[PDB]
C-alpha cells in the first residue's frame, strides 16, 4: 500500500510550501481544508489566526474534534462548513465575525481543480480569493499538474476512446477523447473530467483538469501574478536539503526511501511527484 508514504510526502511538501510564504503573525484562510490536517504546520510558522472552510460537514466535524484535542495553542482556529467555489465566501463566513479579513494567506491543498468544473465556479473561486486577501498577500497550494497530464495525453492516439495511463498503483481515466479529437487540445479549459484510481485510496470523486495557462490568465485578470509553479519533483529536490534536519525525527524517518535518500520511490514517483505541482500567486492590485 502506497498510502502511508504518499501521505508523508504530501505532508513534507505542504510543510515546506506553508513555511515558504507564511510568516509569524499571519491570518490564514484555507479553502477546502478537509479534516484540518495542517494545523501544526501553520503553528510552526507562528500564525495568529487560522480560518478553514470545507463543503463537507463530516470533514469539518472531524477537524473540530482534532482541534479541540490539542492544548495551549497560541493561535485562534475557526472551522466552517461552507462552499468555497460555487458561492460567495460572504455566505460561509457571515456567522463568523471573528474572522480577521483581509487575511495574509489563502491556501488550498489538493482541491482547487474542483473549481474548474465550470467557468462560473473558477471565477467565483478567484473572486472569493482576491476579496479575502490583502494586497501583497499570497495565494498558494497544490494541484494536479495539467502539463504532465497533457504530456501523457499527447502520447495517447485518437483511437483510444477513454484516454488512460498509470502503473501498478494508480490509473487516470478520462471521460472522453475530445482532447485527441480536437488535435490534442482541450475544447474548453473547464469541465474536462477524469477519474483517478489509487491503490487503497479512501475516496473517489469526479476530477477536473485545471489547465495552468487558464489558471494563470484568470488569476491575472483578478489581480494576482504568478510566483511559483514548480512540480512536486523539482520543488522537493530543491528544498529538501534545507529542510531534512529541520524536520522532526518522525517526519524524517517517514520520508526515508529504501536507499536512505528522502522522498518517494519506484511506482510511487510518478503519481506522487510528477502528477502534482505547487502554485503560488501574489495579489498585486485590487480587482475592478
Going by the annotation, the residues of the binding site are 10-11, 14, 32, 54, 83, 109, 114
Q: Which residue has the cell 523539482?
A: 234
Q: Which of 9, 42, 54, 140 binds ligand SFG (CB under 6 A)?
A: 54
Instruction: Give me the 14-53 binding string for ligand SFG, x by CB under 6 A, dash otherwise.
Output: ------------------xxx--x----------------
Per CB under 6 A, the list member of 86, 102, 191, 254 interacting with ligand SFG is 86
Residue 239 interacts with ligand SFG (CB under 6 A): yes or no: no
C-alpha–C-alpha distance, residues 250 and 255, integer Å:
9
Please identify, using beta-carbon distances, which residue of 67 and 110 lies nearer to ligand SFG: 110
- CB neighbour list of residue 36: distance below 8 Å, 6 or more residues apart: 30, 52, 60, 62, 63, 66, 67, 77, 79
Annotated binding site for mRNA: 10-11
Q: Does 84 bind ligand SFG (CB under 6 A)?
A: yes
Residue 278 CA to chain centroid, in angstroms?
Answer: 7
Stretch 102-131: interaction string toward ligand SFG, x if CB under 6 A: -------xxx--x-----------------
Q: What's the closest the beta carbon of residue 231 comes to ligand SFG, in angstroms?
A: 17
- The CB-of-288 to ligand SFG minimum distance in angstroms stands at 26
* Helix axes 119-132 and 212-221, enclosed angle (nearest 10): 50
Phi then psi dihedrals of residue 201, to 5 deg: -65, 150
Chain positions 198 to 237 lying near ligand SFG, rule: CB under 6 A, are none
63 binding ligand SFG? (CB under 6 A): no
Contacts of 134 (CB under 8 A, 6+ apart): 102, 103, 104, 283
Task: Please report how close the Cβ of residue 18 comes to ligand SFG at its closest, in angstroms.
Answer: 12
Nearer to ligand SFG, 109 or 214 (CB): 109
Q: Which of 28, 29, 77, 83 binds ligand SFG (CB under 6 A)?
A: 83
Report, in angstroms and rounded to the nearest whole number, the Rg of the chain calculated over CA atoms: 19
Could you tell me which stretch among 78-86, 157-165, 215-223, 239-247 binds ligand SFG (CB under 6 A)? 78-86
Looking at 28, 55, 224, 273, which residue binds ligand SFG (CB under 6 A)?
55
Residues ≥6 apart with Cβ < 8 Å to 14: 38, 41, 109, 142
Enter the DSSP assignment of 208: E
Closest separation in Å from C-beta 203 to ligand SFG: 7
98: exposed, middle or buried (C-beta count within 10 Å: 0-12, 13-18, 19+)? exposed
- Residue 255 makes CB contacts below 8 A (sequence gap 6+) with 8, 9, 12, 247, 262, 263
Asked if 96 contacts 80 with a C-beta cutoff of 8 angstroms, the reply is yes
Name which position in 11, 22, 49, 59 contacts ligand SFG (CB under 6 A).
59
Give whole-number Cα distances, 288 to 153, 158, 223, 270, 284, in Å. Answer: 37, 42, 9, 41, 13
Note the residues at the interface with ligand SFG (CB under 6 A).
32-34, 37, 54-56, 59, 83-86, 109-111, 114
Amino acid at each position: 500500500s502506497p498510502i502511508i508514504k504518499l501521505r508523508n510526502f504530501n505532508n513534507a511538501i505542504k510543510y515546506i510550501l506553508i513555511d515558504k510564504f507564511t510568516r509569524a503573525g499571519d491570518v490564514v484562510l484555507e479553502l477546502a481544508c478537509g479534516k484540518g490536517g495542517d494545523l501544526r504546520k501553520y503553528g510552526a510558522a507562528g500564525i495568529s489566526q487560522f480560518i478553514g472552510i470545507d463543503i463537507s460537514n463530516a470533514s469539518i466535524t472531524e477537524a473540530l474534534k482534532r482541534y479541540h484535542s490539542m492544548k495551549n495553542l497560541e493561535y485562534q482556529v475557526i472551522l466552517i462548513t461552507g462552499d468555497c467555489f460555487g458561492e460567495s465566501l460572504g455566505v460561509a463566513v457571515e456567522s463568523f465575525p471573528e474572522c480577521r479579513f483581509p487575511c495574509d494567506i489563502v491556501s488550498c491543498q489538493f482541491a482547487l481543480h474542483y473549481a474548474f468544473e465550470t467557468e462560473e465556479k473558477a471565477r467565483r473561486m478567484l473572486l472569493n480569493v482576491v476579496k479575502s486577501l490583502k494586497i501583497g498577500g499570497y495565494f498558494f497550494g497544490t494541484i494536479p499538474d495539467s502539463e504532465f497530464i497533457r504530456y501523457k495525453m499527447n502520447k495517447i492516439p485518437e483511437s483510444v476512446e477513454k484516454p488512460s495511463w498509470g502503473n501498478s498503483i494508480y490509473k487516470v481515466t478520462f471521460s472522453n477523447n475530445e482532447y485527441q479529437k480536437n488535435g490534442n487540445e482541450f475544447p474548453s479549459p473547464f469541465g474536462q473530467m477524469y477519474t483517478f484510481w489509487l491503490e487503497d485510496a479512501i475516496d473517489n470523486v469526479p476530477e477536473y483538469v485545471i489547465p495552468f495557462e487558464s489558471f494563470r490568465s484568470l488569476a491575472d485578470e483578478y489581480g494576482m501574478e504568478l510566483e511559483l509553479q514548480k512540480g512536486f519533483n523539482e520543488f522537493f529536490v530543491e528544498e529538501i536539503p534545507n529542510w531534512v534536519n529541520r524536520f522532526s525525527p518522525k517526519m524524517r524517518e517517514g520520508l526515508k526511501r529504501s536507499d536512505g535518500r528522502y522522498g518517494v520511490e519506484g511506482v510511487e514517483k510518478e503519481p506522487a511527484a510528477y502528477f502534482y505541482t505547487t502554485f503560488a500567486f501574489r495579489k498585486v492590485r485590487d480587482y475592478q
